[PDB]
Design a protein around this ligand. Structure first.
Ligand code: MG
Ligand code: MG
Ligand code: MG
Ligand code: MG
Ligand code: MG
Ligand code: MG
Lengths: 97, 87, 250, 287, 105, 129
């Protein structure tokens, strides 16, 4: 009974909307523009993970470092607790050692 | 469609307003002005005279040099006395 | 008067430049107004479909920032007190009403925070991918060189009819040297079209080249791409980012 | 190439045809199913299966190997030991042959780095380049090379080929500026003075036998004759060489670049050099 | 004004060698004209454009670099191409009486 | 206070180059370091081995597992199989057995078990690549 008895409404996807059509343009901004702009400068998102990558612990550390002062009180408390828990997990638990 | 204009570096020097509280401090010191001058020449608007140390800074630099970087004659004399003691 | 283009950059001795028809958009029948010699190292390299896949996946993924997030048992509201004592109740032992087992509890291994998927292929790899895409289009007869993108009129119907008459694909990617100098006629024609997309030379990419069935280049764009891509070959290992001044790098 | 003909034959390459190179994508192994489920590769119940096995290096309570071995000063002061990147005469000759280093001009650390003959990491306590006698028997280039250290045999080879070699000191800051001058110019600071060698290094750079840049030039001919006698070659009178001026050119001990004095500011934006005129600044930068 | 779509079908003319040598004489003479090298962009463009205009079938960019000689041009132009859809290609292939093909496209 | 001047030649001297310079013409070859330019015209063999961007033969030692020694001829164009046949013919007398090799046609590379970098470099120089 965990199965729907009717077909879901058809999902129409416009493969040629502007976003899809122009997707990827300027990905080669660096190599095709005398390296004035790095491709990572095209990344739009959280200030603490623009052109950067890491596991959850590194992401949380970077978030606290870069926007920790601007975080809300309980969000910052949760981030501190998450960093603490992730430190304990990655530095004290696991199959390999 | 037509692509949006390609992203470009902001031309010329970038001078943040010191009054704004959100402007980072490193963007307000003399080092930022020196870098702007190096990057954009006279278009920076930075007075070149400011690049060199002010007399107080020069005095501090001279004091530090006297304190930590001895002259060649002093180094040679110290080496000579050390060698005499060792012999 | 034929429009003949030669290869400005030196060509390897063992290789001969590939050739293409220089066409024009001023008329439906103007399918051959000249002949262009295209650098073999840019338009005849090996068909590196694996490199094409690498670059396409890099383009799709490096910008990705998944904002999915879930609350762990620590972040779910409440759930501090022990529901019932360890022993005596005859029920399973529990420490909070927000453990992953409980309804409304936390997620044990859900997505965590906004996650970046950023990574950079070597710029040589990315340039090689661009070269391979260009060679693939040329070899599969989807690349068309134009003297200029100037159109007789800015009517999109004209452009669509021209493409259909010349047997271009359902999707066309037109490329011009710079954004500022692109003809107003072609700008107007492509602003109202979905499958006909007009981009500057700097915006060329493997993903869009593959998405669009045909690739239309102007002669200045061809020269610009040849220069930029061939530069990656025969360049030193960088001493510092190329954005900084170099003896011979504009 | 037949590959491009095969492409012409084959359908269009699109985003629905792409495949990673086989062998470049290992399957992901996850703990589901009979083979990878159940105990999920963790074994039977125990500390390791629970995932709380002791730290690395712990030996169950026996004194660890790495703690029962006595402490010895193997790495004492490692971060303060000076490091010199080797530059064999083989490498130098190869660079000159390929034209990445121009022997017609004085060869210094800047030219070596620009020609990519050597990579210098001042942050990793690299104090410069040391000439290395490797390839001496096949070195046939007349060059004016400035280095930080130089072996006796390397000096002998360089001088026998009719060239000149001098050992010059560079503090970490001057070394960084020399290796990467353009970023320093973009910093927008006046060119600093090159600091003198530390007391321990003073004798090396004042000794003529090492061709020290602070050594007495009067003793250079004697040392060159000694090397020529030792290694059985006739010392060439470079004074008669047409390139004698270039072979003689040497930067001042307090000068980082050949033609630029301390205190100057290089405005690369408009191709200019601002030179201070204040008497105090001039005295300081000349001191 | 849009000319009607030009059918891609091309059957080599019977007097193809004569037409090609006439065009070669018009553009460029020596014996064994088959081996005249098209290394010159002007001459290659003239010959190929004339042939395309006359025969309604041009050398694609993919094969353009391969036309190193008039012999190569002749080889390219003496191979027919048919644009009939796969439906026609199958139906007009002497289908046995018990095989029926229908297309809903 | 400030005095500008045009002695920018000494800064242009410090400016580094981004493009690898073409090797200068030498009166006699091989050059003292052993380098030798490819012969002009290129050999008419079925295959071609392009030089590296530093103008050296693309023959490289490789090691895996700490004991698998291999030599890779990388920038091959044309009949990689002809190159493999030629390499086997040239190397079998040295080994006494036909060398075991992998012909990566897709990458245009040839991999040979064992270290033969110097011998293959000399052989390709003789062939004129
Ligand atoms: Mg709680
Ligand atoms: Mg919930
Ligand atoms: Mg089992
Ligand atoms: Mg156990
Ligand atoms: Mg005990
Ligand atoms: Mg390896």
């Amino acid at each position: 009974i965990g199965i729907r008895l009717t077909l879901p409404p058809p999902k129409v996807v416009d493969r040629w909307n502007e976003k899809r059509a122009m997707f990827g343009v300027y990905d080669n901004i660096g190599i095709l523009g005398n390296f004035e702009k790095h491709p990572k400068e095209l990344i739009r998102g959280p200030i603490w993970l623009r052109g950067w990558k890491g596991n959850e612990l590194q992401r949380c550390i970077r978030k606290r470092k870069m926007v920790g002062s601007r975080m809300f009180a309980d969000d910052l408390h949760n981030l501190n607790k998450r960093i603490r828990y992730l430190y304990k997990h990655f530095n004290r638990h696991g199959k390999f050692r | 469609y037509r692509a949006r204009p390609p992203p470009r570096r902001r031309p010329g020097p970038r001078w943040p307003d010191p009054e704004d509280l959100l402007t980072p401090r490193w963007q307000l010191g003399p080092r930022y002005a020196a870098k702007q001058f190096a990057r954009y020449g006279a278009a920076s608007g930075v007075v070149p005279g400011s690049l060199w140390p002010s007399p107080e800074q020069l005095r501090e630099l001279e004091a530090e040099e006297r304190e930590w970087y001895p002259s060649l004659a002093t180094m040679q004399e110290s080496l000579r006395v050390k060698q005499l003691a060792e012999e | 008067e034929p429009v003949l283009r030669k290869v400005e950059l030196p060509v390897p001795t063992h290789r001969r430049p590939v050739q293409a028809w220089v066409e024009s958009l001023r008329g439906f029948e103007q399918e051959r107004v000249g002949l262009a010699d295209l650098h073999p190292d840019v338009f005849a390299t090996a068909p590196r479909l694996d490199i094409l896949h690498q670059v396409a996946m890099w383009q799709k993924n490096f910008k990705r920032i998944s904002y999915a997030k879930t609350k762990t048992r620590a972040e779910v509201r409440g759930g501090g007190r022990k529901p019932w004592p360890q022993k005596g109740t005859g029920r399973a032992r529990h420490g909070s009403i927000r453990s992953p087992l409980w309804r409304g509890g936390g997620v044990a291994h859900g997505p965590r925070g906004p996650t970046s998927y950023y990574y950079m292929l070597p710029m040589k790899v990315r340039a090689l991918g661009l070269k391979v895409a260009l060679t693939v289009k040329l070899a599969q007869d989807d690349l068309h060189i134009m003297d200029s993108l100037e159109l007789p009129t800015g009517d999109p119907q004209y452009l669509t009819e021209l493409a259909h008459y010349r047997r271009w694909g359902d999707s066309v990617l037109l490329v011009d040297l710079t954004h500022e100098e692109m003809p107003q006629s072609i700008v107007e024609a492509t602003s109202r079209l979905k499958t006909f997309n007009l981009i500057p030379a700097v915006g060329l990419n493997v993903h869009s080249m593959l998405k669009h069935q045909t690739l239309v280049l102007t002669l200045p764009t061809v020269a610009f791409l040849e220069d930029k891509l061939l530069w990656q070959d025969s360049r030193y290992r960088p001493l510092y980012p190329f954005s900084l001044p170099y003896s011979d790098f504009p | 190439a037949r590959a491009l003909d095969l492409l012409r034959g084959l359908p269009r390459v699109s985003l629905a045809n792409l495949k990673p190179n086989p062998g470049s994508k290992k399957p992901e192994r996850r703990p589901r199913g009979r083979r990878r489920g159940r105990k999920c590769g963790r074994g039977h119940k125990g500390e390791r299966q629970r995932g709380t096995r002791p730290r690395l290096g712990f030996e169950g309570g026996q004194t660890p190997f790495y703690i029962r071995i006595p402490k010895y000063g193997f790495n004492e002061g490692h971060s303060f030991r000076r490091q010199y990147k080797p530059l064999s005469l083989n490498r130098l000759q190869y660079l000159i042959d390929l034209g990445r280093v121009d022997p017609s001009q004085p060869i210094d650390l800047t030219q070596l780095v620009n020609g990519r003959g050597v990579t210098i990491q001042p942050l990793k306590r690299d104090y410069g380049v040391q000439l290395v006698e490797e390839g001496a028997d096949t070195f046939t280039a007349k060059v004016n090379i400035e280095v930080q250290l130089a072996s006796e045999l390397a000096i002998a080879a360089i001088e026998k080929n009719g060239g000149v070699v001098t050992t010059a000191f560079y503090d970490p800051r001057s070394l960084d500026i020399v290796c990467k001058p353009v970023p320093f110019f973009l910093r927008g600071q006046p060119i600093p003075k090159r600091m003198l060698p530390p007391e321990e290094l003073v004798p090396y750079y004042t000794d003529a036998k090492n061709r020290g840049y602070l050594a007495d030039p009067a003793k250079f001919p004697e040392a060159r004759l000694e090397l020529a006698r030792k290694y059985g070659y006739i010392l060439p009178d470079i004074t008669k060489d047409e390139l004698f001026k270039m072979l003689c050119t040497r930067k001042d001990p307090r000068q980082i670049f050949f033609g630029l004095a301390p205190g100057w500011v290089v405005n690369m934006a408009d191709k200019k050099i601002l030179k201070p005129t204040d008497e105090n600044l001039l005295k300081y930068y000349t001191s | 004004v849009c000319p009607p779509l030009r059918s891609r079908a091309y059957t080599p003319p019977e007097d193809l060698q004569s037409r090609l040598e006439s065009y070669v004489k018009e553009v460029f003479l020596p014996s064994n004209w088959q081996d005249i090298s098209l290394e010159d962009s002007r001459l290659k463009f003239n010959l190929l454009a004339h042939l395309a205009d006359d025969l309604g079938h041009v050398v694609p960019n993919s094969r353009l670099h391969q036309m190193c000689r008039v012999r190569d041009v002749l080889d390219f132009y003496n191979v027919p191409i048919q644009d009939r859809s796969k439906f026609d290609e199958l139906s007009a292939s002497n289908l046995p009486p018990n095989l029926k093909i229908t297309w809903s496209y | 206070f400030v005095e500008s001047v045009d002695e920018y030649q000494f800064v242009e001297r410090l400016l580094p180059a981004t493009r690898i310079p073409d090797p200068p013409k030498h009166e006699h070859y091989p050059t003292p370091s052993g380098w030798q330019p490819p012969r002009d015209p290129p050999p008419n063999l079925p295959y071609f081995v392009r030089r590296s961007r530093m103008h050296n033969i693309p023959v490289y030692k490789d090691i895996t597992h700490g004991n698998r020694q291999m030599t890779v001829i990388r920038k091959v164009e044309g009949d990689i199989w002809a190159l493999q046949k030629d390499v086997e013919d040239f190397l079998s007398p040295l080994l006494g057995k036909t060398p075991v090799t992998q012909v990566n046609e897709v990458t245009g590379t040839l991999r040979i078990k064992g270290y033969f970098d110097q011998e293959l470099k000399a052989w390709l120089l003789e062939k004129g690549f």
